[PDB]
């Protein structure tokens with residue numbers, strides 16, 4: 001027997017309640033409204049109001065996404081929102097791994113096969129085979145080597161691209177050179193023909209993709225930002241695009257979302273924009289992960305997917 | 314000890330001669346010029362002149378490509394060109410399998426993730442997440458289930474797309490529904506959200522992708538022509554593009570190559586054009602396949618990659 005409160009600003013609240021009741025039949029599930037101060041054991045939230053969590057000794061909070069920077073930043077401004085005793089969980093993969101693989105593999109191959117060059121030539125009705133690129137010149141670097149970074153690396157390794165990753169701690173993936181810490185970031189960047197960003201938004205990573213980082217990439221590099229918009233200094237990226245340093249950039253996330261129409265990114269020739277749809281939360285897989293995690297918590301089984309509030313992700 | 318004559322209209326003749334001499338050190342290799350009637354054991358050819366092969370009792374001819382429709386059509390017009398005793402071989406895979414996989418996986422995922430829709434929206438600086446497509450609605454059909462068709466099917470199966478193939482004879486690939494013969498072509502087409510053409514050019518397949526075939530596809534279908542241009546009736550494809558039957562078409566081959574500038578395909582919004590570069594012949598891999606095949610022929614080992622002239626491919 002448990003009480004679950006649910007909040008999401010836009011999802012189909014009623015669908016989630018019913019799906020949760022089926023997956024956890026002993027649970028009483030309700031949508032949280034302002035003024036609801038009744039007891040609750042678990043909270044499933046996205047962009048929760050401070051009032052929903054403040055003062056509650058919850059058994060756990062589940063953030064309905066892979067990123068938790070919005071909740072953590074709100075907790076920094078409102079420390080009363082989440083008691084330190086409450087463990088905070090996020091969605092680990094739950095289908096977002098495959099979605100990132102689809103996105104990254106498609107576009108890496110797109111660039112590797114020079115479909116962007118052939119499109120420019122097609123615009124002028126110009127027929128001209130181009131020299132093929134070689135894998136030895138197409139090392140792919142993944143900023144962030146976590147749940148999603150590892151999935152993307154694995155899918156690209158299938159295609160025999162040289163691979164490297166960057167994180168805080170060393171990784172052991174065969175065939176993927178692991179770089180760790182700011183002290184190794186420059187060496188990491190020196191060979192990244194394609195740079196894929198899958199970092200979390202933390203104070204230590206804000207603005208990391210800036211002029212100083214971009215200039216260390218090889219010439220004709222490609223940028224794939226699948227993480228958070230604050231990671232990229234957009235005016236620095238535009239300068240690197242205009243100078244020829246970056247041959248192409250595909251961006252799914254931006255400092256302001258929706259991306260304002262005045263942004264030069266919309267109409268820049270070498271920029272491809274998707275409206276933050278790289279890896280969406282699939283309700284059925286999220287319900288399965290949450291219900292399974294709750295069962296593991298009840299059985300005392302060690303669990304994965306817990307946020308370290310001191311660490312920031 | 315053997316004599317090899319080499320002809321290619323555009324490749325680096327001298328590089329090929331030297332590479333062949335290294336791979337087959339007992340071989341005397343020479344570029345064929347008009348008037349060269351000296352003896353030869355093997356001929357490596359692409360678009361060979363009739364004079365090069367006529368009257369020669371060669372041990373084998375190796376066509377320097379996967380398709381042999383140009384040689385077979387020339388032999389039909391000049392039956393004296395190749396004695397019936399001469400076995401004819403083509404390049405089987407030799408790296409073209411992976412190239413077709415790169416091409417097909419990239420573009421299938423491109424369409425599956427609606428990057429074409431997001432690009433149209435980006436042209437207007439319009440931010441709008443779109444509903445995701447589902448694999449159950451994205452059955453991929455492969456016209457031609459051969460060396461390259463099987464490789465493409467295998468790579469797409471990795472991504473959990475429903476798969477079917479069409480050929481003359483039944484296939485046994487687990488998870489891929491095999492359709493065989495014209496009598497099953499209509500049933501094959503009925504579910505193909507994406508149609509990938511990897512057929513050979515033969516009299517039995519010319520013009521197969523026409524109005525009658527396209528109308529049997531599901532609405533919003535996609536066409537990927539990686540095979541030969543004569544397979545597609547281009548005015549029928551344009552009509553299906555203008556009516557909304559076909560959502561997108563990516564074409565690497567055309568009835569006339571280079572594609573004349575007057576073709577409406579160049580500037581049609583839903584058409585993507587590459588200049589016959591889907592899977593190019595890589596000299597080093599071709600030299601390895603040819604030298605290995607010759608050794609197998611000398612040892613009496615059963616060989617693959619032989620053209621059936623009565624069959625047409």
Ligand SMILES: NC(=O)c1ccc[n+]([C@@H]2O[C@H](COP(=O)([O-])OP(=O)(O)OC[C@H]3O[C@@H](n4cnc5c(N)ncnc54)[C@H](OP(=O)(O)O)[C@@H]3O)[C@@H](O)[C@H]2O)c1
Pocket residue numbers: 066067068092093096143144145146147148149166167168169170181182198199200201202204205226227228252253276277278279280313
């Ligand atoms: N639609 C979308 O665009 C979409 C969807 C889902 C997620 N995302 C984004 O993708 C991000 C990654 O998700 P995930 O599940 O892969 O997260 P994760 O498993 O926590 O992985 C985070 C990785 O970043 C590394 N990292 C963090 N801070 C660092 C620093 N200061 N220096 C170097 N490396 C650092 C971590 O290194 P260690 O391994 O050493 O800890 C870890 O490898 C999310 O935070 C979210 O913002 C975007």
Ligand SMILES: NC(=O)c1ccc[n+]([C@@H]2O[C@H](COP(=O)([O-])OP(=O)(O)OC[C@H]3O[C@@H](n4cnc5c(N)ncnc54)[C@H](OP(=O)(O)O)[C@@H]3O)[C@@H](O)[C@H]2O)c1
Pocket residue numbers: 379380381405406409456457458459460461462479480481482483494495511512513514515517518539540541565566589590591592593626
């Ligand atoms: N850059 C490029 O665009 C590029 C590069 C390389 C090749 N290609 C093209 O790709 C083609 C395929 O090469 P491949 O090595 O895969 O050839 P393959 O191994 O001979 O495969 C041909 C397939 O087509 C099927 N087929 C032939 N005639 C048919 C008919 N009348 N009805 C139904 N099915 C039929 C065959 O069926 P069975 O299996 O029953 O015999 C076979 O499965 C080449 O011929 C070439 O034109 C293009």
Ligand SMILES: [K+]
Pocket residue numbers: 234235263264265
């Ligand atoms: K901007």
Ligand SMILES: [K+]
Pocket residue numbers: 547548576577578
């Ligand atoms: K045309």
Ligand code: NA
Pocket residue numbers: 017
């Ligand atoms: Na209710």
Ligand code: NA
Pocket residue numbers: 330
């Ligand atoms: Na010479």
